[PDB]
Structure formats: structure tokens, C-alpha cells
Amino acid sequence: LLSLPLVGSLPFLPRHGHMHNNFFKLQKKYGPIYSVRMGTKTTVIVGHHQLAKEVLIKKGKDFSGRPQMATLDIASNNRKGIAFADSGAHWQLHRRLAMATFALFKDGDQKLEKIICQEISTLCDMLATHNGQSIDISFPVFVAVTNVISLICFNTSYKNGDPELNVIQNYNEGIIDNLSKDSLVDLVPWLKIFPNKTLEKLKSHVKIRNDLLNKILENYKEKFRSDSITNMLDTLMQAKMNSDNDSELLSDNHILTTIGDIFGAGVETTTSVVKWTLAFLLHNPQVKKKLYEEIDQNVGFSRTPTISDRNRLLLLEATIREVLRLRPVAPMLIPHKANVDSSIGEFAVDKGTEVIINLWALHHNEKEWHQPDQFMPERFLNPAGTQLISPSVSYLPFGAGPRSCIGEILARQELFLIMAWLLQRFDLEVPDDGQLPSLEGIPKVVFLIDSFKVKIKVRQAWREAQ
């Protein structure tokens, strides 16, 4: 009695559990590196920090490519921009100009700290009007970080009530929802097997965004001046101007898509982490209580928190590190691709192979972390609690190497200042219905959290002062 002819085999059920965890569970059986074949395409999944650092750092240039996806093609206007552009001249030029722009907010009066605090001050006055009510703080935080990035990109911002903010929120939501069903990593190409309108829907959302950025870029052409380089669009037009004396790599479509990536990444990524951090503080009142004490003893109510306070609010800094470990923004980074024949752990990897770094596995490795599934900001502090520490080398929240995060300085300062200002001024508690946020998460292009509500109250201590 023979065995059945076998035309296909997958190690776990598709659409059953979170992809990054399914891969991690497989390492028990198959090791920290294995492959899956899907037609002509082979994908390698790497789940150990030493192999990850080889792909990202040591052989970074070998695996600095991106795989081309029909979905990502539409969002990136055919692989323009930064995040979804393949390695090469385009990507390297626009990545440098983006990083170069964040230099113009180092110091001065538009010091990045000052643009951020300006928008947090509006956020906090906004939220204070909801004293005693339970609310979803998604949109208020979205507005604040949208204005930070609009100032970095255009030196402009939106006033309260501007309907355009809602238009952006709408198509941000629609693109993320249709960009991928779950993670960017899909084992089966359902998009090409059964009839569906995913690409149609994604196209219409991308049309609205492209139309909106065009209007901004068009009306700004007449305001641009060579001697005034104060934001990202200036940096890009200066390069286009000093090029027509590589100008094909600076067409209007190239400038638009790159600013779209910064606009998108700068908003959806920071809003999500704030929401996650809040959710964890609701499940961990003990940690929340010690944070209030920490900020009352090191900043008080004489002033508002500053970036310099990052040397004094250590537990707050440790909390942000722990959220970025436990619920990484990108559990599997963005997929990589081998530009040439190379190797990982001395295993052959052919050119064109898609390579995926399971950051979730790195952050939950039980040999590298103590009780990895527990929210313990303590793990990033010495036993005394007097200085931050790096307990593990298997920790890469922002990736590393050629394709690493370029908005890391912005994210860290936004996250620290938002939480510092909120904790100084507000009690943040379970809403009166008693529901706690679900910490399971929703894997999309970003690791999102289910929407939830918080009862916001102006702290008595903050009130008694002033």
C-alpha cells in the first residue's frame, strides 16, 4: 500500500496564527535558517541574531535588495522612493538626501526637539478638553506626528480641524489594509490565484495620495529658492537643480514617492508605538505608577519635559525599549533580496533569493532573554535602576546595515517626548466599561494594535501647580 503522490507541502497552515510566530515555532524542528519554494521563487527565513547580523551587516551589501511585489509596486509608483526601491542608484541617492535632510534639524531654532514639543503642546491641550472621558487617542496623536513630518518635509503644518488630515487618515488606512492581508510575507500568492479587487482598491487609495502630494509639490515649485534649504523638499529640488548643470533619478515622480515614504513612515510608525506603549501601561499599573514617580522627582511641574531629560527618565526609556522588543514595528523587517550569489551560515544563497529576518524570533529567543514574553522594562536597567543596559545582543528594533531605519532619531525623540508630556499631565486609566486593550496585535505592513479607549484625567498634581 503506497504513499500518495505529493505535489505540495507546507509546514504550517496558511492564515493560521501570526506568520512571524509560525516561522519561529518551526525553528524548534528545522533550525534557525530554512527555505520555502513557491513556484520559481525561493525564500530564506533567518531566525538567529548571528545569521541576521551576517545578512544585515557583514554581508549587508549582498542582501540589500528588495523583492518586487505587485502590491508594493503600486504603493511605490513602480519601486521609486526608498523603502520598497531595489538597491541601486535611485535608492542610494534618495536615501542619502533623506538622511541629509535630518541634519538640518540637528540644532538651531528648528531643532527637532522644538518642532516636536510644539506639536505635543497642542496635543496635550487638546486631550485635556476630554478630562474625565474615555477616548481613542489615535487621531490626536496622528495629527501631532503628521504636523512634525509636514514641517520636516514642507515647513508647513495643519491647523486644528483641517479636513485634509481626515483625507490622509482615510487613504493611509486603505493602503495599509490593502498593501498586504497580514504581513508583507505571504507564503501563497492568493492575490494571483482567485479573482479579487485588492489591486483595484489599493490603486484608488494611491491615486488620492499621489494627487495630494502633487498639489503640494506643484504649488511649492514657485516658492523654492536655492539659498533657502530648510526642509526635505528643498534638499530634493536642490539636487535636481545641481544635476541639470543623475537628473533622471530626480524626476517629479521620484521626489513625490520619496516624500510619500517619509510622510507615511513618519506617521503610521510612531502613532502605532505610542498606542502600544499606552496599552502596556494599562495592563501594568505597577510600571505606570513608578513612571509617574520618576517624572515627578526628576522633572516636576516647573516646566515641561525636554530631550535632556532622557538622561534622568531611565525607566521611561527602558519602557520604550521593552515595547520595541516585545511588539516590534516590523516583526520581520522589510523583506530583503540577495543582489549576488552569497551565503548565510555558509549555506548557499542564489542571487534573487528573498531573505527574511525574523526579528520576532530574535526578540523572543529564550537563551537570549529572561522570560521573553513578559513586559519587563527592568530588563533594560541595571539592578539598582541607575543606568540603562543592553541585556541582549539579539535586539535590533530598527534593523541594521544598509537598509536600516533612517528615521530612528526622529522616532526615539517623538516617542520619548510624547510619553513624557502625557505622563506629566494626565492620569491614563482603564475606561469605565473595564475593557483592557488586546495585546495580540494585527500584523500588517506595520504591527498594529486593535483600537482601544483610555480614560484621560488631568492629574491633580499638575492642577495644583499653576
SS (H, E, C) the chain: CCCCCCCCCCCCCCCCCCHHHHHHHHHHHHCCEEEEEECCEEEEEECCHHHHHHHHHHCHHHHCECCCCHHHHHHCCCCCCCCCCCCCHHHHHHHHHHHHHCCCCCCCCCCHHHHHHHHHHHHHHHHHCCCCEEECCHHHHHHHHHHHHHHHHHCCCCCCCCHHHHHHHHHHHHHHHHHCCCCCCCCCCHHHHCCCCHHHHHHHHHHHHHHHHHHHHHHHHCCCECCECCCHHHHHHHHHHCCCCCCHHHCHHHHHHHHHHHHHHHHHHHHHHHHHHHHHHHHCHHHHHHHHHHHHHHCCCCCCCCHHHHHCCHHHHHHHHHHHHHCCCCCCCCCEECCCCEEECCEEECCCCEEEECHHHHHHCCCCCCCCCCCCHHHHECCCCCCECCCCCCCCCCCCCCCCCCCHHHHHHHHHHHHHHHHHHEEEECCCCCCCCCCCCEECCCEECCCCCEEEEECHHHHHCC
Nearest distance in Å: CB 412, ligand HEM: 8
Instruction: Decide whether 56 or 455 has the Cβ nearer to ligand HEM.
Output: 56
Site for ligand HEM, rule CB under 6 A: 56, 82-83, 95, 261-262, 265-266, 269-270, 273, 324, 329-330, 333-334, 397-399, 403-407, 410-411
Instruction: Decide whether 67 or 399 has the Cβ nearer to ligand HEM.
Output: 399
Which option in ligand HEM, ligand 6D7, none does residue 446 bind, with CB closer than 5 to 8 A by kind?
A: ligand 6D7
Nearest distance in Å: CB 133, ligand 6D7: 29
Which option in ligand 6D7, ligand HEM, none does residue 209 bind, with CB closer than 5 to 8 A by kind?
A: ligand 6D7
172 is in an annotated binding site: yes
Which option in ligand 6D7, ligand HEM, none does residue 115 bind, with CB closer than 5 to 8 A by kind?
A: none
Instruction: Decide whether 278 or 410 has the Cβ nearer to ligand HEM.
Output: 410
Which option in ligand 6D7, ligand HEM, none does residue 305 bind, with CB closer than 5 to 8 A by kind?
A: none
Which option in ligand HEM, ligand 6D7, none does residue 175 bind, with CB closer than 5 to 8 A by kind?
A: ligand 6D7
Site for ligand 6D7, rule CB under 6 A: 83, 171-172, 175-176, 209, 260-261, 264-265, 268-269, 329-330, 334, 405, 445-446
Nearest distance in Å: CB 372, ligand HEM: 18
Nearest distance in Å: CB 94, ligand HEM: 9
Which option in ligand 6D7, ligand HEM, none does residue 361 bind, with CB closer than 5 to 8 A by kind?
A: none
Which option in ligand HEM, ligand 6D7, none does residue 324 bind, with CB closer than 5 to 8 A by kind?
A: ligand HEM
Pairing of strands 354-357, 41-46: parallel
Instruction: Decide whether 112 or 406 has the Cβ nearer to ligand 6D7.
Output: 406
Instruction: Decide whether 154 or 426 has the Cβ nearer to ligand 6D7.
Output: 154
Nearest distance in Å: CB 264, ligand 6D7: 3
117 is in an annotated binding site: no
Nearest distance in Å: CB 260, ligand 6D7: 6
Instruction: Decide whether 237 or 357 has the Cβ nearer to ligand HEM.
Output: 357
Instruction: Decide whether 264 or 305 has the Cβ nearer to ligand HEM.
Output: 264
Name, in order, each residue with C-beta under 8 angstroms of 434's C-beta and a sequence gap of 6 or more: none
Nearest distance in Å: CB 130, ligand HEM: 25
- Binding site per annotation, positions: 172, 405
- Binding site per annotation, positions for substrate: 172
- Binding site per annotation, positions for heme: 405
